[PDB]
Structures are given as C-alpha cells and as structure tokens.
Design a protein around this motif. Structure first.
Motif, PDB file in Angstrom:
ATOM      1  N   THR A   1       7.096  -6.157  -9.304  1.00 22.82           N
ATOM      2  CA  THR A   1       6.473  -5.312  -8.294  1.00 22.82           C
ATOM      3  C   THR A   1       5.071  -5.807  -7.942  1.00 22.82           C
ATOM      4  OG1 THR A   1       5.675  -3.771  -9.998  1.00 22.82           O
ATOM      5  CG2 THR A   1       7.795  -3.287  -8.969  1.00 22.82           C
ATOM      6  N   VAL A   2       4.594  -5.439  -6.755  1.00 19.61           N
ATOM      7  CA  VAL A   2       3.188  -5.618  -6.412  1.00 19.61           C
ATOM      8  C   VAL A   2       2.762  -4.570  -5.376  1.00 19.61           C
ATOM      9  CG1 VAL A   2       3.703  -7.331  -4.600  1.00 19.61           C
ATOM     10  CG2 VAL A   2       1.449  -7.339  -5.700  1.00 19.61           C
ATOM     11  N   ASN A   3       1.523  -4.105  -5.503  1.00 22.65           N
ATOM     12  CA  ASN A   3       0.951  -3.109  -4.600  1.00 22.65           C
ATOM     13  C   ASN A   3      -0.054  -3.725  -3.616  1.00 22.65           C
ATOM     14  OD1 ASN A   3      -0.636  -0.994  -3.448  1.00 22.65           O
ATOM     15  ND2 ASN A   3      -0.181   0.361  -5.172  1.00 22.65           N
ATOM     16  N   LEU A   4       0.175  -3.538  -2.318  1.00 21.77           N
ATOM     17  CA  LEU A   4      -0.749  -4.048  -1.300  1.00 21.77           C
ATOM     18  C   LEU A   4      -2.020  -3.199  -1.162  1.00 21.77           C
ATOM     19  CD1 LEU A   4       1.692  -5.033   1.617  1.00 21.77           C
ATOM     20  CD2 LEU A   4       1.007  -6.366  -0.375  1.00 21.77           C
ATOM     21  N   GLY A   5      -2.053  -2.046  -1.826  1.00 18.05           N
ATOM     22  CA  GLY A   5      -3.238  -1.203  -1.847  1.00 18.05           C
ATOM     23  C   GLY A   5      -3.655  -0.589  -0.521  1.00 18.05           C
ATOM     24  N   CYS A   6      -2.738  -0.533   0.443  1.00 10.87           N
ATOM     25  CA  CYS A   6      -3.065   0.018   1.756  1.00 10.87           C
ATOM     26  C   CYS A   6      -1.875   0.673   2.451  1.00 10.87           C
ATOM     27  CB  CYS A   6      -3.623  -1.080   2.661  1.00 10.87           C
ATOM     28  SG  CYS A   6      -2.449  -2.419   2.992  1.00 10.87           S
ATOM     29  N   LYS A   7      -2.147   1.739   3.196  1.00  9.81           N
ATOM     30  CA  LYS A   7      -1.109   2.429   3.952  1.00  9.81           C
ATOM     31  C   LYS A   7      -0.618   1.574   5.112  1.00  9.81           C
ATOM     32  CE  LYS A   7      -0.092   6.956   5.960  1.00  9.81           C
ATOM     33  NZ  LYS A   7      -0.678   8.243   6.428  1.00  9.81           N
ATOM     34  N   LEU A   8       0.698   1.525   5.295  1.00 10.79           N
ATOM     35  CA  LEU A   8       1.295   0.640   6.287  1.00 10.79           C
ATOM     36  C   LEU A   8       2.270   1.353   7.209  1.00 10.79           C
ATOM     37  CD1 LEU A   8       1.980  -2.575   4.219  1.00 10.79           C
ATOM     38  CD2 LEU A   8      -0.014  -1.970   5.590  1.00 10.79           C
ATOM     39  N   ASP A   9       2.309   0.906   8.459  1.00  7.12           N
ATOM     40  CA  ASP A   9       3.303   1.382   9.412  1.00  7.12           C
ATOM     41  C   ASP A   9       4.570   0.530   9.341  1.00  7.12           C
ATOM     42  OD1 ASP A   9       4.639   2.686  11.431  1.00  7.12           O
ATOM     43  OD2 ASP A   9       3.509   1.732  13.054  1.00  7.12           O
ATOM     44  N   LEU A  10       5.528   0.992   8.546  1.00  8.64           N
ATOM     45  CA  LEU A  10       6.806   0.307   8.346  1.00  8.64           C
ATOM     46  C   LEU A  10       7.549  -0.003   9.648  1.00  8.64           C
ATOM     47  CD1 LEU A  10       8.169   2.146   5.191  1.00  8.64           C
ATOM     48  CD2 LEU A  10       6.419   0.367   5.403  1.00  8.64           C
ATOM     49  N   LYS A  11       7.555   0.958  10.567  1.00  9.21           N
ATOM     50  CA  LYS A  11       8.199   0.794  11.870  1.00  9.21           C
ATOM     51  C   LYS A  11       7.683  -0.424  12.628  1.00  9.21           C
ATOM     52  CE  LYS A  11       9.662   3.633  15.802  1.00  9.21           C
ATOM     53  NZ  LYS A  11       9.246   4.649  16.804  1.00  9.21           N
ATOM     54  N   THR A  12       6.367  -0.514  12.774  1.00  8.53           N
ATOM     55  CA  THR A  12       5.742  -1.633  13.470  1.00  8.53           C
ATOM     56  C   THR A  12       6.023  -2.945  12.754  1.00  8.53           C
ATOM     57  OG1 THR A  12       3.930  -0.190  14.202  1.00  8.53           O
ATOM     58  CG2 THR A  12       3.609  -2.567  14.422  1.00  8.53           C
ATOM     59  N   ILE A  13       5.769  -2.956  11.450  1.00  7.96           N
ATOM     60  CA  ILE A  13       6.067  -4.100  10.599  1.00  7.96           C
ATOM     61  C   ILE A  13       7.497  -4.581  10.829  1.00  7.96           C
ATOM     62  CG2 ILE A  13       6.518  -4.792   8.221  1.00  7.96           C
ATOM     63  CD1 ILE A  13       4.087  -2.992   7.444  1.00  7.96           C
ATOM     64  N   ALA A  14       8.454  -3.693  10.585  1.00  5.11           N
ATOM     65  CA  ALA A  14       9.873  -3.982  10.773  1.00  5.11           C
ATOM     66  C   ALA A  14      10.203  -4.494  12.171  1.00  5.11           C
ATOM     67  CB  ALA A  14      10.688  -2.751  10.481  1.00  5.11           C
ATOM     68  N   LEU A  15       9.594  -3.870  13.171  1.00  4.77           N
ATOM     69  CA  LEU A  15       9.794  -4.265  14.555  1.00  4.77           C
ATOM     70  C   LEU A  15       9.281  -5.679  14.826  1.00  4.77           C
ATOM     71  CD1 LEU A  15      10.715  -3.387  17.388  1.00  4.77           C
ATOM     72  CD2 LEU A  15       8.462  -2.346  17.712  1.00  4.77           C
ATOM     73  N   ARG A  16       8.076  -5.974  14.351  1.00  7.21           N
ATOM     74  CA  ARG A  16       7.450  -7.272  14.595  1.00  7.21           C
ATOM     75  C   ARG A  16       8.071  -8.417  13.797  1.00  7.21           C
ATOM     76  NH1 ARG A  16       0.872  -6.143  14.724  1.00  7.21           N
ATOM     77  NH2 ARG A  16       0.860  -4.844  16.614  1.00  7.21           N
ATOM     78  N   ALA A  17       8.291  -8.184  12.507  1.00  8.02           N
ATOM     79  CA  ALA A  17       8.739  -9.235  11.598  1.00  8.02           C
ATOM     80  C   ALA A  17      10.116  -9.798  11.931  1.00  8.02           C
ATOM     81  CB  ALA A  17       8.727  -8.720  10.170  1.00  8.02           C
ATOM     82  N   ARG A  18      10.259 -11.107  11.749  1.00  6.74           N
ATOM     83  CA  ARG A  18      11.550 -11.775  11.861  1.00  6.74           C
ATOM     84  C   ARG A  18      12.173 -11.884  10.473  1.00  6.74           C
ATOM     85  NH1 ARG A  18      12.635 -14.573  16.846  1.00  6.74           N
ATOM     86  NH2 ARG A  18      10.798 -14.560  18.219  1.00  6.74           N
TER      87      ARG A  18
END
Lengths: 88, 98, 185, 113, 147, 120, 51, 99, 237
Positions: C19-36
C-alpha cells in the motif's frame, strides 16, 4: 427428500440479480440529488423515507444527512414519519 | 358413535389447516424480501408429525393452549391382562357425561 | 543451515501486496476520465483501477488519496510500480506523494516433488491443520511460528501466504519441511 | 447491400421528419434540400515524491489525434478479462474501416494487452 | 379414514395465492408478481424407520415396541406452483411430490405390514396370529381409541 | 415550486456568507442563473410566492433574509427576563446561531454575564 | 407479604431445582411488572399506559 | 431509451452538417434540428435491430482502454476483423461501447 | 421466568366499548427470543433429514455455546445453526455432506462451510476426518441395492483408498464411483445420473473417478462376490 445443490437454484437467480449492476449507489453529485428532492417537492408536501430512498436510489445515512441540511421531519401515530422541504 | 375415523378426521383436519397457514406465513415473508422461493423449505413437517402423535399419546383432544378440556379419554393404553380384556377393551364404547 | 539444504530448493515468490498513501484528497472521476489504461466503475465499486504493462502489475486508487499496489514479484518492483503510479498521478496535476509505502502481504510457492500423506498430517496437527475435500481440495495449515498460512496439496506443491518479509517464508518452510519429508509416501 | 441499408435509413428518417417539418410550418423543399445536401455529403522531495526519476512510463501522449483509427460504434453484451486476456461480446454495431462501411448485429472478440 | 378422508381434506377448497406489494410509491410498468399453490393426490408409504445413519428401512410392530418407536407411516403430497402474473407469463407450472409428515398406522389394517401375511409369516415376524390388532403403537405403547 | 426552494436556499447561503441586505427578485434570479426560468414563473414568484411566505423581510421595496422579519436583535431579551412574573423564553441554540453570529464570541462575555447552557 | 419457602417449597420433582413453585411464578410476574411500573413512573408516562 | 452515441457517427455528423446548413440558411430551427437527430437516432436504432443480421469475430492486441458512466472506450492496434466469409486487417482502431 | 394469561370466563372481561376482552398477554424474553427461534429452525431442519433427537440435542447444545461466546454475533443465526447441525452430525460419527445440509437449510453451501471453519476455531476444538465408510450405507440403501452390493462397495472403496489410487479426490466422489462400479457389476444397474443426483456430485465427476479406478477393477472386488457380468465385459463410459 430432494437433491442437495450448492444453494437454491433461485437463490443463485437472486445472486445473479444482485450481481447485475444494481448494488452500490450514486452518492456523487449532490445537486442532481438536490434537484430530485425538489422534484419530490413538486408532487407532494411529504413522503415516507422508504419511498425517498426508492425514488432517489441513494444510501439512507446520506439521504438523512441531506434531509438534516435542507429540511425537517414530522411523524404521526406509531413512529410513522414523513419529511418535508420546509414549505412556506 | 365416533370411532377411529371420525375422531382422527377431526384431529388431522385441524393440523393440516395449521400447516397450510404456516406455508402462507413463510411464503409471505420471503416475497416481501424477494425472488428465491422454495416450496420444500416452507413446510414445517412437525405440525402433522408431532401433532397427531402427541394427541394419540396423552389423550388430550384438539389442539393445545385453548380448547382441550372437551375430551380426555379418547385414547387409552390397551389393557393386555387376559386375551378377553384386550378383545373387550378394543370393542368398548363410551358416553361423554358429567 | 543443513536443515535448509534438502529442500535446498528454497520457495519462489509469486505475489506481493503493498500500500501507499498519496496524502491528499482526489477527484477519482476526473482522474479516471483523464487517465489512459484505466478503469472506473462507480455504480459497482468505489475506486478507480489502474494497470501498467512493465513489471506487469495493477494498482487501486481511493478517493481518500490512499492506494494499493499489487502484482510485483519483488519489493524493488513494488517500489518501482508505486513510484510509476505516483508519477502519472503527479502528471494529473495532483500533489502525489510516495509517503507510507509498505509491504502488506507476500506469497510464496515451491515444489517438494513427492506424494504426501494427509490423514496423518491432520491427525498429528489437529490443533493446526484442517483438510476438508468437501470445501477445498487442499489442506490448510495455520502456523503460528511467523504466523503464516500454508496450502499443502497431494501433488507436493505448496503455497505460503501471510508474510510481509521473505525471512518468514524461509523460516516457515524450514520448520514445516521435516514433517512433510517424514510423511512421504 | 449496405448502401441500401443507408437508403432504407434515408427513407425512414426523411419520412419521419416530414410531419415534424410540417408541424413547424417549414416547406418540403427545405427537406428535399436537406436530403440532397445529405446525399452529396455522403459521397520534501527526495523521499516524499522523487517521482521524476520515473517520468514517461507512457509511450505516447495519445492516438486519437492521429485519426489512424477507422471508427467503430457498438453496444456491448459482455466484457471479460483474464490477465492479459480480454474477452468481448459486442452487439448491434456500425463500422467504418478505411472509408469503407460495415455493420454487425453481434460481434465476439478476444485481445491481449 | 385413509381411503377417503385424508384425501378429502387436502382436496378441499383452499388453494392459496400470494401477491407481494409492488410499485411502492412509484412503479408503472406492470408485474406485481402473483403465485398460486395447489394440492393434488396424496400418497402413503408403508411404515418406515430412519436410522441415525440416515438410511430408511421397513419397521415391524414387534421392533417398534421393543425399541419404543412410534409405528407410523410417511405421507406425501403433490403440490403445484402456478404463475399467471399480470401478463408476461402464465404456463410455467411445476409438479412436486413432497414429504409433509408421519401419520400413525392402526395395527393390522390394510396399511400395516401385517395385513396380507398368512399364519406362517406372522409367526415368523414374531407377532401372534391371534392378536386382534386394530390399535395404534405410540412410543412403544399400545394405544387404542375409544368409540 | 422547486425554484422557490432554490431561491430560499440561495438567500440562506447569503446569510451564511455574512449578509442580510435586501435584493430585487431580478438580482436573485441573475446570480442563481434563473433569470430565464420563464416570465410566468418569475411573475408567480413575485406576486404569490414571496407573498405566501410570512417570514420574508420586506425592506427598501425589496425582499431580505429570511426566517425572521422582526426581533433579529441577535442578543437575549434581558429586559423581559428581569421581570420574574413574566420573564422568559429559553430556546434552541440553533435558532440563535441561525439568527446572526456564532455563539462562542458572544458567549465568552456571556458565560460571566447571563448565559447558562443545558444539554437538552 | 411474600410467603416464605415453606409455603412454596420448590416442588423440585427431579430437575436441578426446576421446581420453582408456581406461586413463585405468580410472584415473578408481580415483581416484574411492579419493578417495571415503578421505573416507568420514575421517568415520563402517558396517563393511560400507567393506568 | 436509445443511446445518443450514433449521433457521433460520420453519417450522423454528415446529417448534422446538412442541418447546420439549413440553420445557416435559417429555414428551420435549431430545436427542429435536434428533433430530427432524435428521430434519426430512433430510426437507426430500429434499423439496426430489424434489418442488420451479419456477424463478425475478431482478434488483436489491446493498446489502451477506458470505462466511465457505463461506457467502455478502447483503442486496439494490429487488429484482425474476421467474418465467416471475409477478412480485414487494420493497424489501429477506436472502439466506443455502451449498453 | 413466569406465567401467562388468556381467555376470559365469558362474563365481564371488558373491552368495555371496543372489542378487547380484558387484556392481551405480554412478551417476556425478547432479548433471547432469537435463541428459541434458532432451536426451532434446528429441529425443523433436523426432521427434514430425520435425525434422532440425540443429534438434535447436541446441535442445540453446540449453538448455545457459540451464542453465549458472542464471538460470531455478526452472521445470521441460520448460518450458525446450519454449521452446528453439520458439526454435530460429523462428531456423532454419521457425517452429512454440505450439499445435504444446504438442501434442507436456507443457507448456501458456501456460507455453512465458512461458518463451520470459524466455529471450530471459536470453540477452540477439532473434529474427526471423514472416511468413505460413513456414506456407503446411506447411498446403497436409498438406491434399493442389495446388502451384498453394499458390502462389495464398502470393500472396493476401502481397498481403493488403501491403494492410494485416488491421490486428490473427495471421499464422496470416490464412494460414488465405487458404488457405480459395484452396481454395474450387479443385477440392479443404476444410471450415473441417479447416483449423481443423490450424492450431489456431477455425473462428469463420477465419469472421471470411474475412469481412474477402472484399470484396476479386477483386483478390488472381495473374493466372496459372484459376478453377474464378467469384468472383461463391464462397459466403459
């Protein structure tokens, strides 16, 4: 006195249904959910929370969290409760 | 004269209706939840099995809780003392009375 | 050690869970949408699923900013994969961190190559062993040495899990091997 | 065969919007002009995030900008995966490959990543 | 009582149907599902006993008394499930033959094992040919009903 | 109907942002992008919906925030409380926080002045 | 007054004390509902349910 | 409800371009154009269901993939479309899928 | 705890105006009213496969131990009850297959099994390992197979496991293939489908297990048995 499967045939049907899309809910987008409450308020002044989760497809703890934020509640008789978006 | 048949017909009738209600209660609770009906799972076989069996044993007639005091000696342990007591006891008949 | 030169075979690592923690709140929707090369099913699950080709692996990133990385056959590859994931996330313009990178589970396997007597093994270790052909075709041994779980099969194949460091696998295996040899058909 | 299908579609669409055009009070010449146009158109850092030492995991910025992808539009029946092995159950599809036109009622596939 | 009355009773007139509630506040598009249950011919097997092993075998009245069993026989019924919901389906019907309970057998009636046997088989089975029968065996006790 | 509850939610948000200044219906509809909600809906909002609510503050020819048209003095009526034959009204903390300002700043002075808190 | 044990002498009949006489069973309701009535009244009570 | 996705098609775009001309000439309204698109959507959906009957099986390499709002989006390379009586090889293809 | 009341003598018994003769009874043990309901399910289930009360009593007893420990409170009573029935039946030396207990329970085979392993750890206890002999009886009897066939079947089963001819196989499948072999050598030939239907095993599972034992079929039968058909004439599947 009947063959013993791994589970009831129909139970598996029930599992398959549960296993088709519906399960988790769309807690995201509060505004559209806000709109849906407004839309509820477009038909009638009060509703059963059982109906409110059915019409919204959202989790109860969350629908409560919203109803605490923008509305109130009113019970009748034996814990029979209805909620209203503060009509004025 | 209520023999073995008119007496049994009564007892089994009440029990089968009792069993019919039990399948209804079970099927109704499931169907409220939804989709998984099993007919074999619903029947509480003990209603008939134990019900006839208890009554033939104790002598207490009808179903328990409420009415039962109506009849008490509808059953007896067969008197095997001579051959005649058995034969006589099988053919005895009783009037209900004070 | 002499006792570890018979199986001198030494078990091979197949899977690691970290496991690893990025230490920040993230918008999964945007991430998922943008990422290939990424998948997100919000109506059936609550997180986004990501996969890289390299050290053939897969990672799961949560809205909290925590993520889990699996699939590496080595801690180096786990450190490599976690960093590669945290990179593309950085590249999403989000304040990705490598903080709290940690191994959570390790899986090992090996082959002793002989037929095993299982009725005895369960007899001799009824307080540990459990073998139920009606549930799963393989005896489950719950060791408390380096509190490890083992799957022992008739073929001679053996899988080991519940470890976070390699030493625990060798120790669990060095310990159990004499018993297995002693139950050899 | 399929140009015919598009013809079928031409007939169905034009006929089903005739009445709508009529309801707007628009003239059928505009509808015919529409069809003619349409037919003609048809043909910390050191430990917290020293991530830049891993830059570019990616092989390309994108592929859809190249327009080297003959397009496919379709519904899916089943999507499956087993590691590098993907399985596709597609249905009711419209294909356009190298400018050529194709269709399917059902399509089943397998692919590796 | 067996040849008539227990049949007559399940062949009564209470076929039960059950309709769960639907369109609970919203709805529209049909289907509050509906189920009906019907009962048919009744069967009665000669008086059997199941060991703790689970394997059934014939009982004989002498055994029933020594080991204190109850001399009863298992009863089965044909049941039907029937869906003629609001429209989508109607024929899907299935027949079952199900164990519902165990009824005590009166001794040496046609449903006893003793009813066909000669003097030799009954002496063989360890039952006295001169025993009048006609009475139940319940938990190892002879129980006779009184008119 | 639902647009009036969106207006009341915006006006409630205006007090939560720090303001009770009166606005026209137009300035509300512009900032909420309901200016084009339809002239019939704007007219029914103006001549029935902001008329059927008895809690709306009418001031400066305009409508203002929102649950109280009077007695928004944001401090306790000590003078009534002086009169032991009529003194009164404890209420709910939520109305007082809703009224104007957070409790704590006023309360530090009040913990040694008049206030008592009950966990009811 | 609660009869002493000699008036209600644990019918016993085998068991391991399961012979907690039937007058005791009547007494166990009386304390139960009375315990419940005192506790009900200690808090708030509708006038009819206490009735 | 039928899916809007086929409005993205070249054919569907050729339609929209024809409509935009009619809008440029102001002979119809934008709202009417939108209404023609809805009818075309239903018509092409109906046409696919009723008319189309052919099937194709395929194999290839997956390059990249996406899944969001119940819509699958892929891009495959070195793909091979095989029909029971045809063969089509292609260097790359974009596949959008919803249901 | 205590008593109850009912009826009314048919005399005064007020509902005064409404229809409620004197007073309704009252519940008393709601906190544990689901322990009694567990026992009701255990007895019902038990009778569906007709166990003696002694098994049912141990099952009842196992549950009361698990319940009081509260260590497994998170799972359905019907799952915990079904596991108790399974453990109790195995400890009493008359094992039932999970497929059998699932048939009578409303709990799926997977959840009864998972609960079962957890209870063994919960009661800090273990159980005996099943053998082929434990099922040979029930199966051969339900198929109306002669005692002599059952005896051969037991021998064939027993000998086969002693010979280690089936390294990784359920004892049930091995039993099922043995029975099939015995029956096909008997006059009372039964189809694979019937056996599979009774044992719960797939008919393909029997097909493999029969295929694996067939090459040593001659050596496995007991000397007392008298063939109906030569083994050189026993069919393959």
């Amino acid at each position: 006195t009947n063959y013993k499967p791994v589970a009831n045939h129909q139970y598996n049907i029930e599992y398959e249904r549960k296993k088709k899309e519906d399960g988790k809910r769309a807690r995201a987008d509060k505004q559209h959910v806000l709109d849906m409450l407004f839309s509820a308020f477009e038909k009638h002044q009060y509703y059963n929370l059982k109906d409110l989760v059915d019409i919204t497809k959202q989790p109860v703890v969350y629908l409560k969290e919203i109803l605490k934020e923008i509305g109130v509640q009113n019970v009748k008789g034996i814990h029979k409760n209805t909620w209203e978006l503060k009509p004025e | 004269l209520d023999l073995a048949g008119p007496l049994l017909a009564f007892l089994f009738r009440g029990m089968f209706k009792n069993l019919l209600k039990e399948v209804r209660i079970y099927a109704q609770k499931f169907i409220d939840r939804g989709k998984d009906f099993n007919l074999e799972l619903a029947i509480k076989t003990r209603i008939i099995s134990d019900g006839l069996k208890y009554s033939l044993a104790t002598g207490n007639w009808g179903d328990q809780k409420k009415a039962h005091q109506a009849r008490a000696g509808v059953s007896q342990v067969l008197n095997r003392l001579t051959f005649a007591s058995t034969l006589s006891h099988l053919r005895r008949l009783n009037s209900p009375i004070g | 050690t002499p006792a570890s030169e018979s199986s001198g075979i030494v078990p091979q690592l197949q899977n690691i869970v970290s496991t690893v923690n990025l230490g920040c709140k993230l918008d999964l929707k945007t991430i998922a949408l943008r990422a290939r090369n990424a998948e997100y099913n919000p109506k059936r699950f609550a997180a986004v699923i990501m996969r890289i080709r390299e050290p053939r692996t897969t990672a799961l990133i949560f809205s909290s900013g925590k993520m889990v990385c699996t699939g590496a056959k080595s801690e180096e590859q786990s450190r490599l994969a976690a960093r590669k994931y945290a990179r593309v996330v950085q590249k999403l313009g989000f304040p990705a961190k490598f903080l709290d990178f940690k191994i959570q589970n390790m899986v090992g396997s090996c082959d002793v190559k002989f037929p095993i007597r299982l009725e005895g093994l369960v007899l001799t270790h009824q307080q540990f062993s459990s073998y139920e052909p009606e549930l799963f075709p393989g005896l489950i041994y719950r060791m408390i040495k380096p509190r490890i779980v083992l799957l022992i099969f008739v073929s001679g194949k053996v899988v080991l899990t519940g470890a976070k460091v390699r030493a625990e696998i060798y120790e669990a295996f060095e310990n159990i091997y004499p018993i297995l040899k002693g139950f050899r058909k | 065969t399929v140009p015919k299908l598009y013809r079928s579609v031409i007939e169905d669409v034009i006929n089903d919007v005739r009445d709508i055009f009529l309801d707007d009070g628009v003239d059928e010449q505009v509808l015919m002009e529409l069809k003619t146009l349409w037919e003609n158109k048809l043909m910390g850092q050191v430990e917290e995030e020293p991530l830049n030492s891993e830059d570019d995991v990616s092989d390309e910025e994108g592929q859809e900008l190249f327009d080297t992808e003959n397009v496919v539009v379709c519904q899916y029946d089943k999507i499956h995966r087993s590691k590098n092995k993907w399985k596709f159950h597609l249905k009711d599809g419209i294909m356009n490959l190298n400018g050529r036109d194709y269709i399917f009622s059902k399509a089943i596939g397998d692919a590796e990543w | 009582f067996i040849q008539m009355s227990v049949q007559r009773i399940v062949e009564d007139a209470p076929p039960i149907d059950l309709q769960a509630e639907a369109q609970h506040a919203s709805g529209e598009v049909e289907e509050p599902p509906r189920y009906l249950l019907k009962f048919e011919q009744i069967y009665l097997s000669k008086p059997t006993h199941w060991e703790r092993d689970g394997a059934p075998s014939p009982m004989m009245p002498n055994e029933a008394r020594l080991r204190n069993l109850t001399y009863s026989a298992p009863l089965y019924v044909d049941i039907t499930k029937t869906v003629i919901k609001e429209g989508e389906e109607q024929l899907q019907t299935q027949h079952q033959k199900t164990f519902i309970g165990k009824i005590p057998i009166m001794l040496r009636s046609t449903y006893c094992l003793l009813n066909g046997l000669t003097d030799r088989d009954l002496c063989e089975l360890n039952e006295c040919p001169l025993d009048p029968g006609g009475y139940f065996i319940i938990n190892g006790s002879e129980k006779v009903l009184i008119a | 109907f639902g647009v009036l509850a969106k207006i009341v939610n915006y006006m409630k948000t205006r007090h939560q942002r720090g303001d009770t200044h009166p606005l026209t219906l137009d300035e509300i509809l512009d900032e909420t992008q309901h200016l084009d909600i339809g002239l019939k809906q704007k007219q029914w909002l103006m001549t029935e919906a902001l008329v059927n609510n008895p809690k709306i503050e009418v001031i400066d020819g305009k409508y203002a925030f929102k649950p109280k048209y009077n007695v928004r003095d944001k401090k306790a009526l000590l003078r009534l409380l002086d009169q032991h034959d009529q003194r009164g009204l404890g209420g709910i903390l939520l109305e007082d926080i809703e009224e104007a300002l957070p409790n704590s700043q006023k309360a530090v002075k009040a913990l040694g002045d008049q206030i008592l808190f009950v966990n009811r | 007054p609660v009869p002493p044990l000699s008036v209600r002498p644990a019918v016993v009949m085998q068991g391991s004390a399961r012979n907690q006489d039937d007058l005791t069973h009547k007494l166990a309701d009386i304390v139960k509902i009375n315990n419940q009535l005192r506790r009900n009244e200690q808090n708030g009570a509708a006038a009819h349910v206490i009735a | 409800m039928a899916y809007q996705l086929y409005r993205n098609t070249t054919l569907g775009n050729s339609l929209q371009e024809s409509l935009d001309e009619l809008i440029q000439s102001q002979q119809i309204t934008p709202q009417l154009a939108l209404q023609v698109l809805l009818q075309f959507d239903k018509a092409i959906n109906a046409a696919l269901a009723q008319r189309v009957r052919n099937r194709v099986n395929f194999r290839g390499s997956l390059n990249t993939y996406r899944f969001c709002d119940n819509v699958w989006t892929f891009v495959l390379n070195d793909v091979e479309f095989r029909e029971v009586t045809e063969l089509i090889k292609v260097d790359k293809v974009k596949i959008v899928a919803c249901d | 705890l205590s008593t109850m009341i009912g009826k009314g003598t048919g005399a005064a018994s007020f509902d005064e105006f409404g229809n409620s003769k004197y007073q309704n009874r009252r519940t008393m043990s709601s906190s544990d009213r689901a322990m009694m309901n567990a026992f009701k399910e255990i007895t019902t289930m038990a009778d569906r496969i007709n166990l003696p009360r002694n098994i049912v009593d141990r099952t009842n007893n196992l549950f009361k131990q698990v319940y009081e420990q509260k260590s497994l409170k998170g799972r359905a009573n019907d799952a915990i009850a079904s596991a108790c029935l399974y453990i109790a039946c195995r400890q009493e030396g008359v094992p039932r297959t999970f497929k059998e207990i699932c048939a009578v329970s409303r709990i799926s085979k997977k959840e009864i099994g998972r609960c079962f392993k957890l209870i063994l750890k919960a009661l800090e206890t273990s159980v005996d390992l099943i053998t082929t002999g434990d099922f040979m009886s029930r199966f051969c009897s339900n198929l109306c197979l002669p005692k002599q066939v059952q005896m051969a079947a037991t021998h064939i089963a027993r000998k086969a496991v002693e010979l280690d001819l089936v390294p990784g196989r359920s004892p049930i499948s091995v039993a099922a293939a043995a029975i099939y072999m015995a029956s096909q050598a008997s006059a009372e030939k039964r189809t694979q489908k019937e056996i599979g239907d009774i044992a719960g095993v797939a008919d393909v599972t029997i097909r493999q297990s029969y295929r694996l034992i067939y090459p040593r079929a001659p050596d496995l039968f007991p000397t007392d048995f008298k063939f109906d058909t030569p083994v050189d004439k026993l069919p393959q599947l």
